[PDB]
Amino acid sequence: PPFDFSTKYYRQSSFFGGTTVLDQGVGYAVILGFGAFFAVFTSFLVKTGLIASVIVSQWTWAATILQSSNVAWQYGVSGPFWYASGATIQVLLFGVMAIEIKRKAPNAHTVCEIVKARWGTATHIVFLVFCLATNVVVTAMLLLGGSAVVNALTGVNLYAASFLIPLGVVVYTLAGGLKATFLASYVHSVIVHVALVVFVFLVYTSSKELGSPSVVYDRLKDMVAKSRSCTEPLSHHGQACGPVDGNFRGSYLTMLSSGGAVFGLINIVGNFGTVFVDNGYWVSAIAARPSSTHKGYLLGGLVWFAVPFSLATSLGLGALALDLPISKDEADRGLVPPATAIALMGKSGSLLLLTMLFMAVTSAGSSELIAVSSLFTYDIYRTYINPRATGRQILKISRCAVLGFGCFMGILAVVLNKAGVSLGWMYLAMGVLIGSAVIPIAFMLLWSKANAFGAILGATSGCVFGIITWLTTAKTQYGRVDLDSTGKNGPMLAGNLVAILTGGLIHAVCSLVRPQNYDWSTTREIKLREEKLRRAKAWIVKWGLVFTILIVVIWPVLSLPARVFSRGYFWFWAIVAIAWGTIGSIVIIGLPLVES
Numbered sequence: 001p002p003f004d005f006s007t008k009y010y011r012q013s014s015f016f017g018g019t020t021v022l023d024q025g026v027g028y029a030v031i032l033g034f035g036a037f038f039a040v041f042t043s044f045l046v047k048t049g050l051i052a053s054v055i056v057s058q059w060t061w062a063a064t065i066l067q068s069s070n071v072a073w074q075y076g077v078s079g080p081f082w083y084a085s086g087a088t089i090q091v092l093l094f095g096v097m098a099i100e101i102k103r104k105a106p107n108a109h110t111v112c113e114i115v116k117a118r119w120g121t122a123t124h125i126v127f128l129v130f131c132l133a134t135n136v137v138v139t140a141m142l143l144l145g146g147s148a149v150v151n152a153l154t155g156v157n158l159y160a161a162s163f164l165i166p167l168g169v170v171v172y173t174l175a176g177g178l179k180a181t182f183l184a185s186y187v188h189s190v191i192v193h194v195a196l197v198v199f200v201f202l203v204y205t206s207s208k209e210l211g212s213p214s215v216v217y218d219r220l221k222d223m224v225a226k227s228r229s230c231t232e233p234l235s236h237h238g239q240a241c242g243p244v245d246g247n248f249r250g251s252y253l254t255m256l257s258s259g260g261a262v263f264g265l266i267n268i269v270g271n272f273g274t275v276f277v278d279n280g281y282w283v284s285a286i287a288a289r290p291s292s293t294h295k296g297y298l299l300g301g302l303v304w305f306a307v308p309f310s311l312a313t314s315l316g317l318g319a320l321a322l323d324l325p326i327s328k329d330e331a332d333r334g335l336v337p338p339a340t341a342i343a344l345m346g347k348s349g350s351l352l353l354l355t356m357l358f359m360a361v362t363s364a365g366s367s368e369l370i371a372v373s374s375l376f377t378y379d380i381y382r383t384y385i386n387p388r389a390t391g392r393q394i395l396k397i398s399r400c401a402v403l404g405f406g407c408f409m410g411i412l413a414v415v416l417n418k419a420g421v422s423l424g425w426m427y428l429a430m431g432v433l434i435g436s437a438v439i440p441i442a443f444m445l446l447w448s449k450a451n452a453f454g455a456i457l458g459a460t461s462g463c464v465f466g467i468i469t470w471l472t473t474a475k476t477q478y479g480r481v482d483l484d485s486t487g488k489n490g491p492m493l494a495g496n497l498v499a500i501l502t503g504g505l506i507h508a509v510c511s512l513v514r515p516q517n518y519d520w521s522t523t524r525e526i527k528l529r530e531e532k533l534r535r536a537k538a539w540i541v542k543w544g545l546v547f548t549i550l551i552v553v554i555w556p557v558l559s560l561p562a563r564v565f566s567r568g569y570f571w572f573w574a575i576v577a578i579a580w581g582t583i584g585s586i587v588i589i590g591l592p593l594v595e596s
């Protein structure tokens with residue numbers, strides 16, 4: 001027993017594996033009786049302070065809670081920062097796109113409806129597949145994290161919980177109409193900003209094991225020790241015993257991390273492909289009013305930064321200090337937060353984490369069910385199958401396109417849990433697959449010299465050129481090609497960078513040769529005023545760029561001279577983390593109540 005505080009663990013090969021905390025009755029009632037319960041609850045109840053809450057609501061997926069801590073268990077303190085740093089980029093790209101949607105195409109319901117107008121019907125069917133693949137990739141990795149936490153904490157069979165989760169979201173979507181309400185989007189941002197405060201104040205303030213920022217420091221300095229022998233009876237391969245490979249001096253408390261720095265690039269490339277190629281973002285930008293409220297997107301983006309930052313800094317750095325025997329596979333599957341929650345407050349932190357996770361799963365898997373349904377009913381039914389009917393049919397074949405997707409996703413989730421895919425491989429592989437269609441979409445709304453064949457070729461060749469590099473680098477640097485060598489940070493960076501850049505270069509070189517000068521006169525008709533929509537854009541591209549350059553660039557640069565953090569500097573980091581996540585938890589729960 002190397003340490004006196006972790007002696008009941010002596011070393012195991014995994015934290016989980018037997019004697020589940022909860023019983024199957026609790027697990028079979030949460031995956032099936034949460035969407036229905038909230039559907040009845042919302043029907044029981046009949047500004048720039050209510051736009052921030054709705055903005056925060058749809059941006060919280062099941063990966064925000066589970067992967068931010070996965071990249072904090074490795075790399076130390078650079079993980080949560082590099083994960084959360086992609087926050088002002090989204091707000092800038094959402095504002096500057098919601099302005100142009102209102103200015104150049106007011107009567108559209110889907111992104112692929114502005115594609116058939118600008119360009120032809122041959123570049124429509126390519127992006128109609130490149131958009132339907134993103135709704136599959138994102139929906140398939142909140143059924144991978146949801147079905148692993150439930151099986152771990154409770155004991156429900158994972159193949160039987162992968163098929164019952166989508167059916168609890170289909171009921172929630174069908175009930176309450178296939179539309180969003182400002183009342184149901186306010187109760188979702190209240191529950192997730194209460195568990196955040198509870199978990200942050202339990203780790204650095206109150207717990208009888210990890211109680212102060214000066215205990216985490218002394219316990220994270222002892223894990224990375226050069227005199228710690230952990231060959232075969234005192235650790236295993238991927239169990240995080242000693243010095244970190246790639247960190248300055250092997251320390252967890254440093255911002256000089258290379259593995260954590262390349263994940264920032266991967267995260268940036270991956271997050272650009274979900275605000276452009278995902279129709280769920282276009283649906284929620286069409287239904288906004290930038291002219292009336294546009295300062296509510298910055299306040300709804302500066303508060304979301306504290307959710308993956310504070311919670312990860314607590315729940316991922318409190319697992320290293322407690323010496324839990326978490327293996328690498330379990331950490332990948334999304335099992336660090338439930339590992340810390342049982343260790344700190346067992347049988348009661350596990351019910352709080354389940355509620356916080358399934359309040360995000362059910363509220364983010366309903367935004368994809370109404371994004372695939374619209375992309376079907378408005379684009380493959382009333383464009384090509386039957387364009388002469390609009391009465392009572394548009395609704396039937398919109399309600400019937402949710403049930404089909406909720407079953408296809410359920411079957412595909414069963415198929416990918418048998419194989420062995422884990423959020424953590426799908427999260428990193430998103431860019432390699434759908435990054436080639438990002439710039440051909442920005443050029444559609446922002447550039448007046450972009451043609452159709454260039455878009456087709458740039459979208460359809462970048463994917464192949466990215467996958468070839470992604471599968472080649474792993475083969476030439478690791479021997480074989482399987483789920484292990486492919487998920488490394490080497491191949492994935494090459495794949496992401498090739499995919500995003502080649503599809504932009506090919507499209508922007510082939511368009512300066514044969515330009516199509518477009519006045520947007522065809523997208524403006526599909527089915528004062530300009531002064532406000534010109535000052536709003538001026539405000540956004542200034543006050544979003546300032547914060548982007550201030551957070552992504554200046555803040556990490558000034559932390560490099562700190563080298564290994566010293567007691568007193570970690571007290572500053574661990575206090576910024578608590579302050580952001582506390583003063584962000586009042587402006588969401590009390591500001592949209594100063595309506596009075």
Ligand SMILES: CC(C)CCC[C@@H](C)[C@H]1CC[C@H]2[C@@H]3CC=C4C[C@@H](OC(=O)CCC(=O)O)CC[C@]4(C)[C@H]3CC[C@]12C
Nearest residue numbers: 082085246257258259261262263264265266268552553
């Ligand atoms: C704005 C963010 C999202 C991206 C910023 C990009 C660059 C500023 C970063 C990204 C990857 C970084 C590199 C990641 C890894 C290394 C290896 C590292 O090599 C070593 O010193 C370790 C080698 C050894 O000692 O064996 C030197 C810095 C370098 C090139 C880093 C330099 C800074 C880079 C290029």
Ligand SMILES: CC(C)CCC[C@@H](C)[C@H]1CC[C@H]2[C@@H]3CC=C4C[C@@H](OC(=O)CCC(=O)O)CC[C@]4(C)[C@H]3CC[C@]12C
Nearest residue numbers: 469473477488489490491493494495497498501502505
């Ligand atoms: C995990 C360890 C053991 C291996 C680490 C390997 C990486 C550090 C190397 C291997 C292959 C390299 C890549 C090979 C090819 C490219 C493509 C290149 O991108 C372009 O050429 C884009 C421009 C265009 O194609 O238009 C940028 C460098 C990059 C990502 C290289 C970056 C460094 C990589 C990822």
Ligand SMILES: CC(C)CCC[C@@H](C)[C@H]1CC[C@H]2[C@@H]3CC=C4C[C@@H](OC(=O)CCC(=O)O)CC[C@]4(C)[C@H]3CC[C@]12C
Nearest residue numbers: 248249255256553554556557558559560561562563564
């Ligand atoms: C645009 C140009 C003109 C200025 C860019 C500013 C920064 C990007 C540079 C300027 C000084 C640099 C620092 C100069 C010295 C070091 C010490 C160096 O420490 C070591 O690794 C050596 C210590 C040891 O191994 O004993 C780490 C990088 C750092 C902080 C450098 C990080 C990058 C800094 C902040």
Ligand SMILES: CC(C)CCC[C@@H](C)[C@H]1CC[C@H]2[C@@H]3CC=C4C[C@@H](OC(=O)CCC(=O)O)CC[C@]4(C)[C@H]3CC[C@]12C
Nearest residue numbers: 553554555556557558559560561562563564566569572
């Ligand atoms: C040559 C070796 C043996 C010694 C190297 C010492 C430097 C690495 C240290 C010593 C004093 C330090 C400086 C002490 C005070 C400042 C002022 C500070 O600037 C401000 O506060 C400007 C803002 C304002 O005053 O409004 C920025 C850091 C800096 C340059 C520090 C940078 C790092 C310095 C130069």
Ligand SMILES: CCCCCCCCCCCCCCCC
Nearest residue numbers: 246247248249256257258261556
């Ligand atoms: C002692 C073992 C090797 C230590 C090498 C550490 C390299 C750290 C480089 C990563 C720093 C990138 C900062 C980027 C900020 C914009």
Ligand SMILES: CCCCCCCCCCCCCC
Nearest residue numbers: 247248249256257553557560
């Ligand atoms: C032991 C070797 C340490 C090397 C550290 C290199 C740090 C370079 C960071 C510079 C990034 C500047 C981005 C603008």
